[PDB]
């Protein structure tokens, strides 16, 4: 069915905080305010797996600090 | 060519507007300025050799960055296909114009170069170093081709035959 | 050109807004059926007043559909000005425009 | 007469199913159809000497109410990798086409 | 006597008939034979009326035949307008009352 | 009598309105329309400037 | 998991389109570069942001901000009861 | 009536009809080539049949029968309705397809 | 209400009786004789009247 | 509002695309606040719950979810793809490339027969499918 209520309150924040021309009695700009992903080629699954392990092991790291 | 040489010096000086108010940032300054890079006294025809090599080497990075080869640039800068490509691989060379834009722009300066290390090793002399550059720049339309890629150049192309006229 | 769009989700935000948390949960989709009959009586010109709707929120539903009224009477004159005048247009502009005037 | 007809045959009814993925269902039509009702038998016709896939099986069933609700629930049931098209099975044997071609001229 | 009608009348049917050549395929062709669209509906063709000065190549006017003999070959101009067979008002009128007063 | 439905052929230099009539009413009025027309042309009730003329 | 457990695989048109195919120095050279970038871009900032500024403010001065003018019916909105906000009924009627 | 008449200032039953067209048919046949001549771009020869008299056109028959009357969704009505451009295309193909009309870059069916 | 899925019918499999009482509501017979033809190479009637 | 559900990650993606297994899945890659998104996210929300049978609709924001950006070539403002059981489907809408629609169409009837076709062909077998309108010329007089 349709998003819930809170869903669309989620959605609707996110719209006023990006679009200050209609929103947010501010200021202005359209779209503004106020990271390895997989290329889809099949050579390349072992770099990227060990990139997103890498990448969550200091993030654990992080987390132990 | 009279005439229209006439209309663009009209159209320039009815068109100009007075500068704007910089803040006199020089980039060359600021490259001093930074670590990568340091100063020298050369002589023109190595600088413009070095140049040369060093866009045939930026324009083939462009080319084999998606590991997919089957396009080759030769140090004229004239690209070609190495076999018959499928309707697929056509596709894939398919690539922007700004990319031929400057390898056209590329193709240009190696031809300059190449007339300069032509006098300089004796193959011609002074005067026909002159003549081939005069040639080159009203022939620009001719030996290189960039108004395939940017038809604002037509009207360079026509001005410089038009100065070939009066000259 | 979307400005209607823009309105809705401005007009449905604000709303929303005020709304306390527990009943945002159920009445955001029965609010917007009304902004959306709202508008289809102010279409037909037909009497709109739900007995049971508080002042408050039938009058904010009120500016939004006087908004939106004017920006569709707006740009179904300038379409037709457009067509009219001689300009490229297709069969669902065409038709839509033809509904509107 | 292949020695293979006699091991559903307990007075049960065999539903024919076509139009089945080759390069699966050795038994996942077993396991999509043992839900309803119990242990069964559900064969699907492999022919040898190349392991290929033939295409349709064959699957037997106690009652004919269960059959029923069966093929109701499953014809174009999503299957493996494609749906299935189920029909009644046929066995015409010789001792049966020899009663058709008896009837035949009376 | 109106020189923008024949114009007018021109482009409109330039636009049809790219219409159906966009239709045909995606993209636009050079030379396209006018025979597809000026055939009689009846001999397989459209059957568009004309009122423009459409010159037929000589080229299309070819065509050959075979039989026991071998291959033969033959030819056959501008395609007609309507104007041509369509009468003037004033030779209808004038005709009008003098065929009318014989009648009577 | 009835209500008549009205929609809009679109020669976009300008709308014309269209009326749908119920079919029964339809039939009274063209009887009627016809009827009024041969009345009207025998007794001459349109002088001869009222154009256009069954004739021209 | 990144995406590739889907067992997808993309496919690409044109080799204009984004990427090719990040340490301490990389770092350092990056800073270099948009330090570079940003006092090229420093020349007419000023002037380009303030005429920016001034144009946005006629223009909303001209035609107001959509929240904006609902600010009123929002904040009278405010008033209403929770006794109320519960009780809304439904088009269905 | 909604429809756009464009005879909408005579009729039929009490002026007669005020033009004539059989000799301009007959004149554009005559002027693209004569019946042998505009044949020759189709494919009827290709048919084969041995004489272009006894013959007769299909209008809306298809290979459904052309199933004018039924329940389809828009886009089979739209499928139905693309067929006879699907049959006129195919018979002025012989003329359409050739490297004249059509620029560059040839293509083999396969097989 | 949503669209149907679009599956087709499993197919008309039995005749006569109820189905051609079926099909005499809506898609009876016709000429299928000289209104479906169009009668290839002369035009026999007055030229363009489509 | 976009009362569409919406995804936040490549897992929820990629598990969302796993969990039909008889509805064509329509994906709608783009920023909610880009008036191409805005305009083509407002056709889905109308042809959703007419297409609720066979269909079901989602909503991906590139920035929050970029992950698959590389893999299909997602940077135009929106764009529109399909997949029937894991497979990505594709649709010879006659603009050059098949993988997807990347404009924002306004015709729910069109996009309506759009993914009638894809689920038609997909649940035939096939994994490129024929639109019943070719986008070459928009078709404008």
Redesign the interface.
């Known amino acids: 069915v349709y998003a819930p209520g809170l869903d669309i309150e989620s959605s609707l924040k996110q719209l006023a905080e990006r679009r200050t021309d209609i929103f947010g009695v501010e200021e202005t700009a359209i779209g503004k305010k106020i990271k390895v992903t997989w290329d889809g080629h099949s050579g390349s699954m072992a770099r990227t797996q060990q990139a997103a392990q890498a990448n969550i092991t200091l993030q654990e790291q992080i987390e132990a600090i | 060519s009279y005439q229209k040489l006439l209309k663009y010096y009209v159209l320039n000086a009815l068109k100009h507007r007075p500068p704007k108010a910089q803040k006199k940032r020089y980039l060359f300054r600021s490259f001093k300025a930074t670590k990568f890079f340091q100063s020298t006294k050369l002589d023109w025809v190595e600088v413009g050799l070095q140049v040369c090599r060093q866009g045939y080497n930026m324009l083939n990075l462009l080319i084999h960055r998606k590991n997919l080869n089957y396009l080759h640039l030769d140090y004229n800068f004239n690209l070609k296909p190495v076999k018959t490509l499928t309707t697929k691989e056509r596709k894939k060379s398919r690539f922007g114009n700004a990319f031929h834009l400057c390898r056209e722009v590329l193709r240009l300066t190696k031809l300059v170069v190449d007339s300069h290390v032509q006098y300089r090793l004796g193959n011609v002399d002074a005067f026909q170093l002159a003549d081939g550059l005069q040639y080159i720049f009203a022939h620009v339309g001719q030996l290189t081709g960039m108004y395939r890629y940017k038809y604002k150049l037509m009207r360079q192309i026509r001005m410089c035959k038009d100065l070939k006229h009066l000259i | 050109s979307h400005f209607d769009l823009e309105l809705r989700a401005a007009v449905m935000h604000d709303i929303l807004d005020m709304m306390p948390e527990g009943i945002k949960q159920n009445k955001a989709r029965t609010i917007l059926q009304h902004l959306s009959e709202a508008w289809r009586c102010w279409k037909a010109n037909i009497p709109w007043k739900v007995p049971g709707l508080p002042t408050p929120i039938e009058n904010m539903i009120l500016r939004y559909v006087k908004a939106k009224a004017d920006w569709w009477t707006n740009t179904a004159h300038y379409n037709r000005e457009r067509?009219?005048r001689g300009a490229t247009v297709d069969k669902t502009v065409?038709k839509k425009n033809?509904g509107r005037? | 007469e292949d020695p293979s007809l006699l091991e559903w045959d307990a007075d049960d009814f065999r539903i024919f199913c076509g139009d089945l993925g080759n390069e699966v269902n050795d038994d996942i039509l077993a396991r999509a159809f043992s839900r309803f009702p119990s242990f069964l038998k559900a064969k699907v016709i492999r022919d040898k000497r190349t392991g290929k896939t033939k295409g349709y099986g064959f699957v037997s069933f106690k009652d004919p109410s269960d059959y029923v609700r069966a093929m109701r629930e499953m014809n174009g049931k999503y299957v493996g990798s494609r749906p299935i098209k189920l029909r009644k099975s046929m066995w015409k044997d010789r001792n049966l086409d020899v009663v058709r071609k008896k009837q035949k001229e009376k | 006597n109106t020189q923008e009608l024949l114009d007018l009348l021109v482009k409109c049917e330039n636009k049809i008939q790219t219409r159906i050549k966009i239709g045909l395929n995606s993209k636009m062709p050079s030379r396209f034979p006018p025979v597809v669209f000026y055939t009689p509906k009846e001999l397989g063709g459209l059957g568009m009326l004309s009122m423009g000065h459409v010159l037929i190549p000589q080229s299309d006017l070819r065509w050959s035949k075979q039989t026991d003999v071998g291959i033969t070959h033959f030819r056959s101009q501008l395609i007609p307008n309507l104007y041509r067979y369509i009468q003037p008002w004033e030779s209808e009128f004038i005709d009008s009352q003098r065929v009318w007063a014989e009648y009577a | 009598f009835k209500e008549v439905g009205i929609?809009?052929?679109?020669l976009?230099?300008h709308?014309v309105p269209?009326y749908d009539v119920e079919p029964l009413e339809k039939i009274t009025d063209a009887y009627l329309d016809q009827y009024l027309w041969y009345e009207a042309d025998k007794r001459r009730l349109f002088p001869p400037w009222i154009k256009?003329a069954?004739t021209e | 998991v990144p995406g590739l457990g889907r067992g997808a695989t993309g496919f690409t048109t044109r080799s204009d389109i984004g990427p090719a195919r990040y340490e301490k120095d990389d770092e350092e050279a990056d800073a270099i570069y948009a330090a570079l970038d940003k006092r090229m871009d420093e020349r007419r900032k000023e002037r380009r942001e303030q005429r920016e500024k001034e144009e946005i403010e006629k223009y909303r001065m001209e035609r107001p901000k959509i929240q904006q003018q609902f600010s009123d019916l929002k904040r009278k909105l405010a008033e209403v009861t929770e006794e109320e906000w519960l009780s809304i009924p439904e088009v269905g009627d | 009536?909604?429809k756009?008449n464009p005879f909408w200032?005579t009729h039929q039953r009490?002026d007669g009809k005020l033009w004539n067209l059989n000799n301009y048919r007959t004149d554009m046949i005559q002027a693209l080539g004569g019946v042998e001549g505009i044949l020759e771009h189709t494919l009827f020869k290709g048919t084969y049949f041995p004489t272009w008299e006894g013959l007769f056109w299909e209008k809306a028959s298809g290979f459904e029968e052309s199933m004018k009357w039924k329940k389809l969704t828009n886009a089979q009505r739209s499928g139905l309705n693309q067929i006879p451009n699907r049959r006129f295309t195919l018979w002025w193909s012989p003329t359409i397809n050739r490297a004249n009309v059509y620029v560059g870059f040839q293509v083999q069916l396969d097989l | 209400k949503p669209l149907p899925a679009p599956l087709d019918g499993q197919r008309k499999k039995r005749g006569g009786r109820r189905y051609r009482k079926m099909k005499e509501r809506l898609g009876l017979t016709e000429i299928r004789k000289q209104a479906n033809r169009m009668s290839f190479g002369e035009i026999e009637e007055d030229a363009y009247q489509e | 509002s976009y009362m569409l559900p919406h995804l936040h990650n490549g897992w929820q993606v990629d598990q969302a695309i796993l969990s039909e297994e008889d509805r064509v899945v329509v994906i709608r890659f783009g920023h909610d606040w880009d008036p191409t998104c805005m305009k083509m996210d407002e056709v889905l929300y109308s042809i959703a719950e007419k297409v609720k049978n066979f269909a079901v609709i989602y909503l991906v924001d590139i920035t929050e979810v970029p992950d698959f950006n590389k893999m299909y070539e997602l940077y135009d403002p929106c764009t529109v793809m399909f997949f029937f059981r894991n497979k990505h489907i594709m649709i010879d809408l006659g603009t050059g490339n098949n993988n997807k629609i990347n404009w924002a169409m306004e015709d729910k009837q069109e996009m309506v027969d759009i993914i009638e076709t894809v689920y038609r062909g997909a649940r035939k077998g096939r994994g490129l499918v024929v639109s019943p309108k070719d986008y070459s010329t928009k078709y404008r007089y």
Request: aromatic share 16%; proline share 5%; net charge negative.
């Open positions: 067509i009219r065409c033809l005037l | 929609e809009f052929m679109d976009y230099s709308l269209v256009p069954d | 009536v909604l756009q200032w009490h």
